[PDB]
Design a protein around this nucleic acid. Sequence first.
DNA 1: TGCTTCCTGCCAATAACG
DNA 2: CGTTATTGGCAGGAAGCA
Length: 118
Amino acid sequence: DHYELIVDGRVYYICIVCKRSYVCLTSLRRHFNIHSWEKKYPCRYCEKVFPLAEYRTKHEIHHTGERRYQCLACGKSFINYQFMSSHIKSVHSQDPSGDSKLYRLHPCRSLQIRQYAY
DNA sequence: TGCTTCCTGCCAATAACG
DNA sequence: CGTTATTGGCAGGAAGCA
Ligand SMILES: [Cl-]
Ligand SMILES: [Zn+2]
Ligand SMILES: [Zn+2]
Ligand SMILES: [Zn+2]
């Protein structure tokens, strides 16, 4: 399945197939489905099947059209982090990863994902 | 070069378990 | 049914297009 590598005390886990390295063992198994496809994640809405659960989920939010990421500076909503960040940097000349709260992530409602409590 | 999708550390939500 | 193991949502940078 894998093999460990230990440098300076820090432990790294290596995919036996593609030799990628992971700090987390959880990340390894998650990544490993790409090779082995033991679990499949089919889109509820079409063709595609994905080797990670979160890839499917992002794809499904695309079909529904829900816009969960909102700019606090002007109200515009976007489908994902990428579009939001892009808008905010170019229109407001600010970075959202930076010191402050520049956007709101609304709960998912156009389908049923895990619901964080904050 | 500007979307589009992928990637992984982190950990909360959820599930399995004795 | 507390308690341990698993899942996958999230950020935000990397990578993959044409
Ligand atoms: Cl919406
Ligand atoms: Zn691999
Ligand atoms: Zn689909
Ligand atoms: Zn704005």
